[PDB]
Amino acid sequence: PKKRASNGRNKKGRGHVKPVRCVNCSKSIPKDKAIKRMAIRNIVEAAAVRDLSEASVYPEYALPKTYNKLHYCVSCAIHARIVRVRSREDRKNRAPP
C-alpha cells in the first residue's frame, strides 16, 4: 500500500524535478527526494584551534569555516545513519531533531 502520503519525496504541482547525485554513491535522485544536509564546519577541526591560534601571524584571527550541502540518496542516508527507519505513527513527524 501507500507507505507515505508524500510518496517519499516532496513534489505536489510539479511532475518533474531535476536530479542530483548522491555524495556517497553518485546515484541520480530527484532533488526533492534527496536527504540534503548542510554541513558547516570549522577548518581546524576544533582540536587544533589553540595550536593554530598560537602559531598564527595575526592576533585574534577570524578562523573561516567551510560550507557544503551534502545530497544523499535514500540508501546512502539510511546506511550512513543520516536518517533511520522510524515507527509508523512517528514517520509523520516533519520536525527536525
Binding site: 601571524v57 573561516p64 557544503n68 551534502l70
Partner: protein, 127 residues
Amino acid sequence: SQVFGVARIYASFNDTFVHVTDLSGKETIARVTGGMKVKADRDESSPYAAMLAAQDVAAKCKEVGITAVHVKIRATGGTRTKTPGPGGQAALRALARSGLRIGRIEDVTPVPSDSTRKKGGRRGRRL
C-alpha cells in the same frame, strides 16, 4: 619580517598533498605526499602519513628560508568528493606544531557551477 609562502594542501581520499610554493605559486618548495611517507597503498591518506609529510615539508621550507605559510585547503572538488580528506587537518596541525607561522587559512576546493557529469552511473556505486 616573516617570509611568506603558500601551503597548498590537497586532502583527497587515498592521498594528501602538502607542498609550499612561493607567494606567486610558481616556485615549488618541498612537495611531499603521504604516499612517499607510507608503504601500504591504503595508508597514503592516513592522518599519520599526512603529518609526516607536513613535518618533512616544514623542515625543507625552514631550510630554504620560508618562515610562514598562507594555508590553502582543497578537496578533489569538481564532480568528486568535495569533502576534505582525512589528511588535510593532520597536515595543517603538523605545520602548526612544526612552528612555521601561519596566516590566512582558506579552502580552494574547485566547486562547479553546474558540473559536467558525475561518474558512477545513474544507479550509482552499487557496493
